[PDB]
Coordinates of C-alpha atoms in Angstrom, one line a residue:
Chain A
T1 CA -6.8 -24.3 3.2
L2 CA -4.3 -22.1 1.4
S3 CA -1.3 -23.3 -0.5
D4 CA 2.0 -21.7 0.3
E5 CA 2.3 -20.7 -3.4
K6 CA -0.8 -18.7 -3.1
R7 CA 0.2 -17.1 0.3
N8 CA 3.5 -16.0 -1.1
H9 CA 1.7 -14.7 -4.2
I10 CA -0.5 -12.4 -2.2
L11 CA 2.6 -11.1 -0.5
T12 CA 4.5 -10.5 -3.8
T13 CA 1.5 -9.0 -5.5
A14 CA 1.0 -6.5 -2.7
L15 CA 4.8 -5.7 -2.7
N16 CA 4.5 -4.8 -6.4
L17 CA 1.4 -2.7 -5.6
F18 CA 3.1 -0.9 -2.8
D19 CA 6.3 -0.3 -4.7
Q20 CA 4.4 1.7 -7.4
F21 CA 1.5 3.3 -5.4
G22 CA 2.7 3.3 -1.8
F23 CA 1.0 1.7 1.2
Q24 CA -1.8 4.3 1.9
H25 CA -3.4 4.1 -1.6
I26 CA -3.8 0.2 -1.5
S27 CA -6.6 -1.6 0.5
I28 CA -7.0 -5.3 1.3
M29 CA -9.8 -5.4 -1.4
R30 CA -7.5 -3.9 -4.0
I31 CA -4.8 -6.5 -3.0
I32 CA -7.4 -9.3 -3.2
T33 CA -8.6 -8.2 -6.6
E34 CA -5.1 -7.8 -8.0
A35 CA -3.9 -11.1 -6.6
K36 CA -7.1 -12.8 -7.9
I37 CA -7.8 -14.6 -4.7
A38 CA -11.0 -15.0 -2.6
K39 CA -11.4 -12.4 0.1
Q40 CA -11.8 -15.3 2.6
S41 CA -8.4 -16.7 1.5
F42 CA -6.7 -13.4 2.6
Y43 CA -8.1 -13.6 6.1
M44 CA -7.3 -17.3 6.5
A45 CA -3.7 -16.3 6.0
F46 CA -3.4 -12.8 7.6
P47 CA -5.2 -11.6 10.8
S48 CA -5.1 -7.8 10.0
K49 CA -3.9 -5.5 7.3
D50 CA -1.0 -4.4 9.5
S51 CA 0.0 -8.0 10.2
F52 CA 0.1 -8.5 6.4
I53 CA 2.2 -5.4 5.8
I54 CA 4.7 -6.5 8.5
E55 CA 5.0 -9.8 6.6
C56 CA 5.5 -7.9 3.3
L57 CA 8.2 -5.8 4.9
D58 CA 9.9 -8.9 6.2
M59 CA 10.0 -10.5 2.8
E60 CA 11.3 -7.3 1.1
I61 CA 14.1 -7.2 3.7
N62 CA 15.0 -10.9 3.2
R63 CA 15.0 -10.3 -0.6
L64 CA 17.4 -7.3 -0.4
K65 CA 19.6 -9.2 2.0
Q66 CA 19.8 -12.2 -0.3
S67 CA 20.4 -10.1 -3.4
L68 CA 23.3 -8.2 -1.7
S69 CA 24.8 -11.3 0.1
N70 CA 24.9 -13.1 -3.3
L71 CA 26.4 -10.1 -5.2
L72 CA 29.2 -9.6 -2.7
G73 CA 29.7 -13.4 -2.5
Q74 CA 30.3 -13.7 -6.3
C75 CA 33.4 -11.6 -6.0
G76 CA 36.8 -13.3 -5.6
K77 CA 38.4 -13.8 -2.3
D78 CA 40.1 -10.6 -1.2
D79 CA 39.2 -8.8 -4.5
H80 CA 38.3 -5.7 -2.4
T81 CA 37.9 -3.4 -5.4
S82 CA 35.3 -5.8 -7.0
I83 CA 33.5 -6.0 -3.7
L84 CA 33.4 -2.2 -3.3
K85 CA 32.3 -1.8 -6.9
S86 CA 29.5 -4.4 -6.4
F87 CA 28.3 -2.5 -3.3
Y88 CA 28.1 0.7 -5.3
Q89 CA 26.4 -0.8 -8.3
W90 CA 23.8 -2.6 -6.0
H91 CA 22.7 0.8 -4.7
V92 CA 22.8 2.5 -8.2
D93 CA 20.7 -0.3 -9.6
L94 CA 18.2 -0.2 -6.8
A95 CA 17.8 3.6 -7.2
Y96 CA 17.6 3.4 -11.0
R97 CA 15.1 0.6 -10.9
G98 CA 9.7 4.0 -11.5
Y99 CA 11.8 4.8 -8.5
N100 CA 10.4 7.4 -6.1
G101 CA 12.2 5.9 -3.1
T102 CA 12.6 2.4 -1.7
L103 CA 9.9 0.3 -0.3
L104 CA 11.6 0.3 3.1
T105 CA 11.7 4.1 3.1
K106 CA 8.0 4.3 2.2
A107 CA 7.2 2.0 5.1
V108 CA 9.1 4.1 7.6
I109 CA 7.4 7.3 6.3
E110 CA 3.9 5.7 6.2
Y111 CA 4.0 3.8 9.5
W112 CA 5.2 6.2 12.2
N113 CA 2.5 4.6 14.3
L114 CA 4.0 1.1 14.2
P115 CA 7.4 1.4 15.9
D116 CA 8.5 -2.2 14.9
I117 CA 8.7 -1.1 11.2
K118 CA 11.3 1.6 11.8
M119 CA 13.2 -0.9 14.0
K120 CA 13.1 -3.6 11.3
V121 CA 14.4 -1.1 8.7
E122 CA 17.1 0.2 11.1
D123 CA 18.1 -3.4 11.7
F124 CA 18.5 -4.0 7.9
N125 CA 20.6 -0.8 7.5
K126 CA 22.8 -2.0 10.3
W127 CA 23.1 -5.4 8.6
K128 CA 24.0 -3.7 5.4
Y129 CA 26.8 -1.6 6.9
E130 CA 28.1 -4.7 8.7
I131 CA 28.3 -7.1 5.7
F132 CA 30.2 -4.4 3.9
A133 CA 32.5 -3.9 6.9
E134 CA 32.9 -7.7 7.1
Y135 CA 34.3 -7.8 3.6
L136 CA 36.3 -4.6 3.9
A137 CA 37.0 -3.5 7.5
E138 CA 40.7 -4.5 7.3
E139 CA 41.2 -2.5 4.1
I140 CA 39.0 0.5 4.9
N141 CA 39.1 2.4 8.2
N142 CA 35.8 3.0 10.1
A143 CA 35.5 6.7 9.1
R144 CA 35.6 5.9 5.3
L145 CA 33.3 3.0 5.8
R146 CA 30.8 5.3 7.4
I147 CA 31.1 7.9 4.7
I148 CA 30.9 5.4 1.8
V149 CA 27.8 3.6 3.2
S150 CA 26.1 6.9 3.9
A151 CA 26.9 8.1 0.4
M152 CA 25.4 5.0 -1.0
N153 CA 22.3 5.5 1.2
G154 CA 22.1 9.1 -0.3
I155 CA 21.8 7.6 -3.7
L156 CA 18.6 6.0 -2.5
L157 CA 17.0 9.3 -1.4
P158 CA 14.2 10.1 -3.9
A159 CA 15.0 12.9 -6.3
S160 CA 18.8 12.6 -5.4
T161 CA 21.0 14.3 -7.9
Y162 CA 24.7 14.9 -8.6
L163 CA 25.3 11.2 -7.7
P164 CA 28.8 10.0 -6.8
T165 CA 30.3 7.9 -9.6
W166 CA 32.2 4.7 -9.4
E167 CA 35.4 6.6 -10.2
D168 CA 34.6 9.0 -7.3
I169 CA 34.3 6.1 -4.9
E170 CA 37.4 4.2 -6.1
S171 CA 39.4 7.4 -5.3
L172 CA 38.1 7.4 -1.7
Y173 CA 39.2 3.8 -1.5
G174 CA 42.6 4.0 -3.1
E175 CA 43.8 7.2 -1.4
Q176 CA 44.1 5.3 1.9
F177 CA 47.7 5.6 3.2
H178 CA 48.0 1.9 4.1
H179 CA 47.4 1.2 0.4
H180 CA 50.7 3.0 -0.4
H181 CA 53.1 1.4 2.2
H182 CA 54.3 -2.0 1.2
Chain B
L1 CA -6.6 36.4 2.4
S2 CA -4.1 38.2 4.7
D3 CA -0.5 37.5 3.9
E4 CA -0.2 36.9 7.7
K5 CA -3.1 34.4 7.6
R6 CA -1.3 32.9 4.6
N7 CA 1.8 32.1 6.6
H8 CA -0.4 30.8 9.4
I9 CA -2.4 28.4 7.3
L10 CA 0.6 27.0 5.4
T11 CA 2.8 26.6 8.5
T12 CA -0.1 25.0 10.5
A13 CA -0.4 22.4 7.7
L14 CA 3.4 21.9 7.3
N15 CA 3.7 21.0 11.0
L16 CA 0.8 18.5 10.8
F17 CA 2.4 17.1 7.7
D18 CA 5.8 16.8 9.3
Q19 CA 4.2 14.9 12.2
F20 CA 1.6 12.8 10.4
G21 CA 2.3 12.8 6.7
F22 CA 0.6 14.4 3.7
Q23 CA -2.3 11.9 2.9
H24 CA -3.2 11.4 6.6
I25 CA -4.0 15.1 7.1
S26 CA -7.1 16.6 5.4
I27 CA -8.1 20.1 4.4
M28 CA -10.9 19.9 7.0
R29 CA -8.3 19.2 9.7
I30 CA -6.0 22.0 8.6
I31 CA -8.9 24.4 8.2
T32 CA -10.1 23.7 11.8
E33 CA -6.6 23.7 13.3
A34 CA -5.8 26.9 11.4
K35 CA -9.2 28.4 12.4
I36 CA -10.0 29.8 8.9
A37 CA -13.3 29.6 7.1
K38 CA -13.9 26.8 4.6
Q39 CA -15.0 29.1 1.8
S40 CA -12.0 31.5 2.2
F41 CA -9.5 28.6 2.1
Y42 CA -11.0 27.2 -1.1
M43 CA -10.9 30.6 -2.7
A44 CA -7.1 30.8 -1.9
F45 CA -6.4 27.0 -2.5
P46 CA -9.0 25.5 -4.9
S47 CA -7.8 21.9 -4.3
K48 CA -5.7 19.9 -1.9
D49 CA -3.2 19.5 -4.7
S50 CA -3.1 23.3 -5.0
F51 CA -2.5 23.6 -1.3
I52 CA 0.2 20.9 -1.2
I53 CA 2.2 22.7 -4.0
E54 CA 2.0 26.0 -2.1
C55 CA 3.1 24.2 1.1
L56 CA 6.0 22.6 -0.7
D57 CA 7.1 25.8 -2.3
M58 CA 7.3 27.5 1.0
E59 CA 9.2 24.7 2.8
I60 CA 11.7 24.7 -0.1
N61 CA 12.1 28.5 0.2
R62 CA 12.5 28.2 3.9
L63 CA 15.1 25.5 3.6
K64 CA 17.0 27.6 1.0
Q65 CA 17.0 30.6 3.3
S66 CA 17.9 28.4 6.3
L67 CA 21.0 26.9 4.6
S68 CA 21.9 30.0 2.8
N69 CA 21.9 32.1 6.0
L70 CA 23.8 29.4 8.0
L71 CA 26.6 29.2 5.3
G72 CA 26.5 33.0 4.8
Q73 CA 27.7 33.3 8.5
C74 CA 31.1 31.8 8.0
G75 CA 34.2 33.8 7.2
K76 CA 35.1 34.1 3.5
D77 CA 38.2 32.0 3.9
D78 CA 36.8 29.6 6.4
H79 CA 36.4 26.4 4.5
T80 CA 36.3 24.1 7.6
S81 CA 33.5 26.2 9.1
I82 CA 31.5 26.1 5.8
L83 CA 31.9 22.3 5.8
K84 CA 31.0 21.8 9.5
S85 CA 27.9 24.0 9.0
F86 CA 26.8 22.0 6.0
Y87 CA 27.2 18.8 8.1
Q88 CA 25.4 20.2 11.1
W89 CA 22.5 21.4 9.1
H90 CA 21.8 17.9 7.9
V91 CA 22.2 16.4 11.4
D92 CA 19.9 19.1 12.8
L93 CA 17.2 18.2 10.2
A94 CA 17.3 14.5 11.0
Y95 CA 18.3 14.3 14.7
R96 CA 14.9 14.9 16.2
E97 CA 12.6 12.6 18.1
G98 CA 10.1 10.8 15.8
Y99 CA 12.1 11.5 12.6
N100 CA 10.7 9.6 9.7
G101 CA 12.1 11.6 6.8
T102 CA 12.1 15.3 5.7
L103 CA 9.0 17.0 4.3
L104 CA 10.6 17.1 0.8
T105 CA 11.2 13.3 0.9
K106 CA 7.7 12.6 2.1
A107 CA 6.2 14.8 -0.7
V108 CA 8.1 13.0 -3.4
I109 CA 7.0 9.6 -2.1
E110 CA 3.4 10.5 -1.4
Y111 CA 2.8 12.3 -4.7
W112 CA 4.4 10.1 -7.3
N113 CA 1.4 11.0 -9.5
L114 CA 2.3 14.8 -9.5
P115 CA 5.5 15.0 -11.5
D116 CA 5.7 18.7 -10.5
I117 CA 6.6 17.8 -6.9
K118 CA 9.5 15.5 -7.9
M119 CA 10.9 18.2 -10.1
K120 CA 10.7 20.9 -7.4
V121 CA 12.5 18.7 -4.9
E122 CA 15.1 17.7 -7.5
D123 CA 15.7 21.4 -8.3
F124 CA 16.2 22.1 -4.6
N125 CA 18.7 19.2 -4.4
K126 CA 20.6 20.6 -7.3
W127 CA 20.5 24.0 -5.6
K128 CA 21.9 22.5 -2.4
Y129 CA 24.8 20.8 -4.1
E130 CA 25.6 24.0 -6.1
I131 CA 25.6 26.5 -3.2
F132 CA 27.9 24.1 -1.2
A133 CA 30.1 23.7 -4.3
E134 CA 30.2 27.5 -5.0
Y135 CA 31.7 27.8 -1.5
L136 CA 34.2 25.0 -1.7
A137 CA 34.9 24.6 -5.4
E138 CA 38.3 26.1 -5.4
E139 CA 39.2 24.0 -2.3
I140 CA 37.7 20.4 -2.7
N141 CA 37.5 18.5 -6.0
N142 CA 34.3 17.4 -7.7
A143 CA 34.7 13.8 -6.6
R144 CA 34.8 14.7 -2.9
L145 CA 32.0 17.2 -3.4
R146 CA 29.6 14.7 -4.8
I147 CA 30.6 12.1 -2.2
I148 CA 30.2 14.5 0.8
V149 CA 26.8 15.8 -0.4
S150 CA 25.6 12.2 -1.0
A151 CA 26.8 11.2 2.5
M152 CA 24.8 14.1 4.0
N153 CA 21.7 13.1 2.1
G154 CA 22.2 9.6 3.6
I155 CA 21.9 11.2 7.1
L156 CA 18.4 12.3 5.9
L157 CA 17.3 8.8 4.9
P158 CA 15.0 7.6 7.7
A159 CA 15.9 4.5 9.7
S160 CA 19.5 5.1 8.7
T161 CA 22.3 3.9 11.0
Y162 CA 26.1 4.2 11.4
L163 CA 26.0 7.8 10.3
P164 CA 29.2 9.7 9.5
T165 CA 30.4 11.9 12.3
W166 CA 31.9 15.4 12.1
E167 CA 35.4 13.9 12.7
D168 CA 34.8 11.5 9.9
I169 CA 34.0 14.4 7.5
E170 CA 36.8 16.5 8.9
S171 CA 39.2 13.6 8.2
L172 CA 38.1 13.5 4.6
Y173 CA 38.9 17.2 4.1

């Protein structure tokens, strides 16, 4: 049977393939040849190509959740500026890291025919708003939260331009009237 | 090739692409759906890549005329209406059943190997910021302009949630 190191290696090899060529271009046999595994090892682990791709999407989502969770958790308690700057930089870094769009966006585009994929990606975007709101919903009203999170999601649109800067976002934050009544 | 048949072929393809994506839909399918002869189509569009670039150019031109005409409808002084229209245009693009991204986003993602497509979509996106700014530059500062336009592009990201509402945007102005 198959070690878990090798199973996870097939998943992470494919993810690297998909990130740079997209899902359509890449077959099972291409994945098998890139990952240097026996064809029979793939099918011991994965019953179908679409089952595999759902497993890849789920590991990409977990990795983004863990990256962002950790970044926001490194900030000091109630250092809301540092949390907001971390959230901004996390999006800029994801967008600047051969980027033609995120892997999750590619999956939603490519798999209109598998409605669980769009729901998984919606669930992650809902999670990403909410962890931000958890750190900041007492310092930032709902309207500004919605604007800021959607402005960060616009940074992830491929070929996005005229990007908001950190200084732009810090102004949105600091202008808030409750910041000026003490 | 009739100019009329030209609009018919390119718009038949765009609607299939909008429904099923670029690589899913073949020339043969477009050619049968459009009811045009193989040999004529290849005289007008020698490759798929050639056809895709013409489709993308038309969609970009249509979007520019769609937004330009919508904004051109507001009164010269009417900054709220300009801003509401820019918001509504983005919602109107993305708030349809089965939405999984705009055609421009799909083209940039599907054709990473054709740098001409990313650059035409980028140029459209600079155009969109700049026409909005030209309306509102004396009224809203650069920081709020960049944030609002980025927020509207986030409405266009597929599977996006917790979208800003008109009243959110109106509160920011």
